[PDB]
Write a protein that binds this ligand. Structure first.
Ligand code: NAD
Ligand code: NAD
Ligand code: NAD
Ligand code: NAD
Lengths: 309, 307, 273, 271
């Protein structure tokens, strides 16, 4: 449709200019069969109450376990789950194929970092406060929820209630960097739930911004069922442009890689000439490409290949 | 020269050569061009308000409030009229602006609302994206920003698009969220050198207060070029050097006159812009050591290595 | 009730006699007398947006989504039709009033505690709106921190949607300050509140901001059927809360909530007055 | 007299009669007893450092602490603030109003000694822990600390660092002061219109709704009568100003006369 076509056009136009930033959620990591948070929350709940949610419960159960069983037990239980390695999925390759200016991810895994190393683009990874000050490269992989690079302790990551409570105080430089990247670059959300803590916090912060002073981030929804229209309006009026993977292609709910692949194939394949079918749009595209050349007396014929990419 | 200034110059030049140097230009650089000092504006506001100029100096609270008192008492129209009268003039750019631009900083952060820095940048043929309003952050037209954190007079000489009164500073964090966070990000991710600012300036006080919340030894201490008439005291130096600053005193180095600021600025600037048979081998080895990782090296590529 | 409960009752009675007692009455108490619990209203709001129907964040979002999408008029409509049914004050209200609390803090918008206060003869200056704080005619306040419908049945008077809670501190500066002062200067007993309630957790965070042993840990009466898990009890106790477990106090079925409330209320009232 | 002045006096007396009057007493009341004025300590610290602007009042103590340690800081503070000055007539004049609460940023014990002399008992709240243990119904709030737990610099908020962290260092005291201001009638005595505390309170009262609170009365007794500009400025900021110099022509240095004149005007109106 026109809405999704315009969304894809904006995403690709931002990507080609190097002004595209990818907000990678936990779904991209789950695609690599990484241990989802709900598994670890269930483990904590079992350890606490013996035998096994919501945004509040996700933060509370780990929080309860932290001060009921101790720091060491928390660290051990989380390391036994997250220490395992996984292979980067095709979605990471598709994310990196867009040459995003920055990658902001709340995941504590290294799959995105491994994909960045694969592609050959050096993304200085910032997962701690000290990382921001000393980051030689201009391409930031911002782990806004900590990372396990320093160690596998629970302090390095933001996954418990008090960690989220003091995030602004605990991560001033990281939060400022993420907000500056969001304000300056085009943001696409992939692997995130619409009712997510991080996304809701970003929306709350965006509400403080002056009207039309920022660009509305894109949100790639890969939920099994098509999004309700009412929720679509609610989230598009909150500062989001939703691209629904379930709407574009019909696939069985149990599998998710197909939806991510469909969205990313639409992103990568899409080109400004992909949508021009009207003969009134062909001239529009050609004039858009050729108009700045009118300032030059003569343009080399062979050079025109650069004009038309 | 001294050793502390030697270290500061070394670090500043190193960072500048890496494209990580940013200049926080203060109001002193603009005053070098004989631009209307803010104290004169406050004196005019006080004369209009109370009928006579204030006896003595003005405190920072006075600077913030006298304009505010006039604005809410004498009306917005008179407040903008005074600004038009005093700021509408165009002044030549002093050598300090060109000296600063000669260092090709990655960004230029300035609280000045004048266009002197923009004119200097153009005179040096530099394309700086001037971000003076909230909407400018998203639609940046260049890689390097001339970020005017106190606004500017491009969109008319109204006082709304500037930070001058007490209310403007009080609600700055809410009035300029994007600009403030972008300035903080540039400070955190770059090497900041302060010029034309006093230790008692409100903006520097706010920046030092913000730097308090940062993690211990997480950021990089910004350099601060101090060129006040008097030499720096040994108490304020310690107080502000453990507060996150890297003060470099102009009066400490150059034994110059008082109220002769221009040359005092120029001394630090050109000490910044001017940059054994046992160190020769060290230099050659430093240039050639990474090349040992390659089986064979072309000689013309060797010419490449030696710049 | 050997130590962890007998001491709580003794302290509560001592404060009540001293007069430095305040009751934070939760929504559950107003549900003991039949009343629309907010989850029913959330279900109705979702049914208006969707076909059929709960996380606390969803609790705050679904009414917020309805207000944003459908509009102020319809939102206020369901709010008024659902919350305009008069209900008889339950024995819990007069049991609470019998303690002679200095103030009464509640996040309820119904007129079920003011009615009890008037029927018992005790006069509490109800403070539900912002302007009522300064124009106070009595020493004792019935502070409705969540607002009420006294001025009107519009949704703006009450805070129930996500945006209302987002700007509460900005929207209700005087009311929040008054509630914080009452909590700090008085011994607070929480009744009819979910242990994981939003309002309870925000106050818990505020008290965490307070310095060590700079305040009296409030009491929390827990009335749902299941006996409190030991780990949760330890966590909330270390969170500056003293839990009185109604379920452990007596033996009763899950759905007899009035019995569980009355067990704690009577043990607190009759025992040494 | 004046219609505005008479209306303000009547409102003050009416609020005092029903027990709503609350007195916000600044350093002006305490300088009548010849207590060390803050610029004395500021000048001593400045002279110690290097052998008055408002920002200097906070900077000089801050730098002096940072350099000469808590050691020199408390040394100077105890040296200058152990005088045991006698209470002035204005303290008893304030007490005679029968105020519900007395909020004082002063750290000297002149006010509480005045309350004891009058016989009125006010529960002193000058520390975080004092709020919980406040037994008396009427609070005497020391929102800047006091030298009753000792003569250390931690007790008071004199320096700039204490001011910066005051909101997070005195949450209970701060919110109790805000509650008293919101739920009572406040009269400011001995405060300069440019005082840090006055300006911070005026900034806070901005967040309040337009008709939520009552505009506090400000009793100015500076030697020079205010300019109309300043009166208009602070009238729209929530302050109702009664000018002692405007009320009666008096000597420039006779601050005691201005304070006493305003106070006996209030008392006589109260009968
Ligand atoms: N809801 C729970 O707390 C809980 C508990 C146990 C299991 N689960 C399972 O997990 C799903 C909820 O996941 P959640 O906590 O991430 O919330 P979520 O479903 O909202 O997270 C959604 C993002 O993660 C993605 N996602 C979900 N399942 C995926 C999968 N198999 N592969 C890749 N991406 C996936 C979706 O992409 C979505 O955009 C439930 O639908 C259920 O199957 C959930
Ligand atoms: N307080 C007043 O407004 C007042 C009244 C009369 C005279 N003056 C003079 O005007 C100066 C204005 O500075 P300020 O007090 O507004 O801040 P300031 O003197 O602290 O600011 C000085 C910073 O700005 C620069 N600066 C100041 N005066 C300069 C000059 N004359 N030429 C070049 N650079 C200069 C210096 O680099 C200095 O570090 C005072 O320092 C003083 O010399 C000021
Ligand atoms: N859709 C749902 O959320 C869901 C699921 C199961 C039960 N319930 C019903 O809602 C409440 C579930 O417990 P809860 O804590 O969420 O309650 P609540 O949190 O929805 O609010 C009421 C609080 O008051 C008390 N209370 C609980 N049930 C009560 C009842 N039936 N009558 C009077 N007071 C009660 C409890 O202490 C409870 O915390 C109960 O009323 C229960 O029967 C709802
Ligand atoms: N501000 C300074 O640093 C400084 C330096 C030298 C002298 N002074 C003197 O202080 C006064 C103004 O500033 P401040 O902060 O020191 O006072 P202030 O006027 O700013 O102080 C507060 C209150 O002080 C009262 N006050 C001032 N002088 C008094 C006196 N002699 N007796 C009784 N009350 C008095 C006024 O009532 C005022 O409301 C001026 O009178 C001035 O002569 C001040």
């Amino acid at each position: 449709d026109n809405n999704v076509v315009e969304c894809i056009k904006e995403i690709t136009e931002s990507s080609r200019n190097g002004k595209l930033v990818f907000f990678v959620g936990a779904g991209v990591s789950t695609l690599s069969d990484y241990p989802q948070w709900w598994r670890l929350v269930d483990k904590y709940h079992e350890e606490l109450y013996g035998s096994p949610y919501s945004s509040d419960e996700y933060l509370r159960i780990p929080q309860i376990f932290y001060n009921v069983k101790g720091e060491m037990a928390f660290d051990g239980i989380l390391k036994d789950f997250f220490q395992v390695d996984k292979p980067t999925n095709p979605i990471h390759d598709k994310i990196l194929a867009m040459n995003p200016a920055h990658v902001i991810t709340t995941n504590y895994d290294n799959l995105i970092d491994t994909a960045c190393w694969k592609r050959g683009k050096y993304f200085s990874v910032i997962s701690a406060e000290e990382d921001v000050a000393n980051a030689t490269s201009s391409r930031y992989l911002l782990k806004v929820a900590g990372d396990f690079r320093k160690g596998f302790k629970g302090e390095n990551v933001v996954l418990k209630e008090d960690d989220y409570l003091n995030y602004d105080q605990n991560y001033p430089l990281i939060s400022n960097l993420m907000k500056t990247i969001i304000a300056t670059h085009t943001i696409v959300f992939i692997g995130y739930g619409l009712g997510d803590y991080n996304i809701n916090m970003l929306l709350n912060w965006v509400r403080k911004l002056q009207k039309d002073s920022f660009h509305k981030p894109f949100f790639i929804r890969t939920d099994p069922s098509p999004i309700e229209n009412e929720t679509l309006i609610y989230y598009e009026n909150k500062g989001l442009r939703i691209i629904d993977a379930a709407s574009l292609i019909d696939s069985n709910e149990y599998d998710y890689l197909e939806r991510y692949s469909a969205v990313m194939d639409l992103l990568i394949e899409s080109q400004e000439n992909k949508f021009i079918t009207k003969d009134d749009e062909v001239i529009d595209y050609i004039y858009g490409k050729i108009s700045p050349l009118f300032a030059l007396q003569y343009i080399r014929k062979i050079d025109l290949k650069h004009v038309f990419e | 020269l001294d050793n502390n200034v030697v270290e500061c110059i070394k670090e500043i030049t190193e960072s500048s050569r890496n494209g990580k140097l940013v200049f926080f230009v203060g109001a002193g650089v603009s005053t070098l061009s004989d631009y209307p000092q803010w104290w004169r504006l406050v004196d005019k506001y006080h004369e209009e308000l109370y009928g006579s100029p204030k006896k003595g100096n003005y405190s920072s609270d006075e600077y913030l409030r006298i304009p505010q008192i006039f604005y809410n008492v004498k009306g917005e129209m008179a407040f903008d009229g005074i600004l038009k009268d005093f700021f509408q003039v165009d002044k030549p750019t002093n050598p300090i602006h060109d000296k600063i631009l000669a260092m090709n900083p990655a960004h230029v952060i300035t609280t000045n609302y004048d266009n002197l820095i923009d004119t200097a940048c153009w005179k040096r043929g530099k394309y700086f994206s001037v971000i003076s309003a909230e909407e400018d952050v998203a639609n940046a037209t260049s890689s390097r920003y001339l970020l005017k954190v106190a606004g500017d007079f491009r969109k008319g000489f109204k006082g709304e698009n500037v930070v001058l009164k007490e209310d403007d500073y009080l609600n700055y964090d809410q009035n300029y969220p994007l600009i403030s966070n972008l300035m903080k990000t540039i400070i955190a991710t770059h090497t900041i050198v302060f010029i034309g600012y006093g230790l008692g300036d409100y903006n520097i006080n706010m920046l030092l207060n913000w730097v308090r919340k940062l993690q211990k030894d997480s950021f990089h201490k910004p350099f601060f070029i101090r060129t006040d008439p008097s030499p720096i005291e040994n108490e304020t130096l310690i107080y502000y050097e453990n507060k996150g600053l890297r003060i470099i005193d102009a009066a400490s180095l150059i034994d110059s006159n008082e109220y002769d600021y221009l040359e005092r600025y120029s001394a630090v600037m050109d000490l910044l812009i001017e940059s054994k048979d046992d160190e020769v081998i060290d230099y050659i080895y430093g240039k050639i050591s990474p090349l040992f990782a390659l089986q064979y090296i072309r000689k013309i590529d060797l010419k490449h290595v030696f710049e | 009730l050997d130590n962890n409960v007998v001491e709580c009752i003794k302290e509560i009675t001592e404060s009540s006699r001293n007069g430095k007692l305040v009751f934070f009455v939760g929504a559950g108490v107003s549900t003991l007398s039949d009343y629309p619990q907010w989850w029913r209203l959330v279900d109705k709001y979702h049914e208006e947006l969707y076909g059929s129907p709960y996380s606390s964040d969803e609790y705050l979002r679904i009414p917020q989504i309805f207000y944003n999408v459908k509009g102020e008029m319809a939102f206020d409509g369901i709010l008024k039709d659902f919350f305009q049914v008069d209900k008889p004050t339950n024995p819990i209200h007069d049991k609470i009033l019998a303690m002679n609390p200095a103030h009464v803090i509640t996040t309820n918008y119904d007129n079920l505690i003011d009615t009890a206060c008037w029927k018992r003869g005790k006069y509490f200056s109800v403070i539900s709106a912002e302007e009522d704080v300064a124009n106070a005619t009595s020493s004792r306040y019935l502070l409705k921190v969540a607002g009420d419908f006294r001025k009107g049945f519009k949704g703006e008077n009450v805070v129930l949607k996500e945006d209302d809670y987002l700007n509460y501190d900005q929207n209700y500066p005087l009311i929040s300050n008054l509630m914080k002062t009452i909590i700090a200067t008085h011994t607070i007993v929480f009744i009819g509140y979910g242990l994981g309630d939003y309002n309870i957790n925000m106050l818990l965070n505020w008290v965490r901001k307070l310095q060590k042993d700079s305040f009296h840990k409030p009491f929390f009466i827990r009335t749902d059927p299941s006996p409190i898990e030991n780990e949760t009890l330890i966590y909330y106790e270390n969170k500056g809360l003293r839990i009185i477990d109604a379920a452990s106090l007596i033996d009763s079925n899950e759905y007899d909530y009035l019995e569980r409330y009355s067990a704690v209320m009577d043990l607190l009232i009759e025992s040494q007055e």
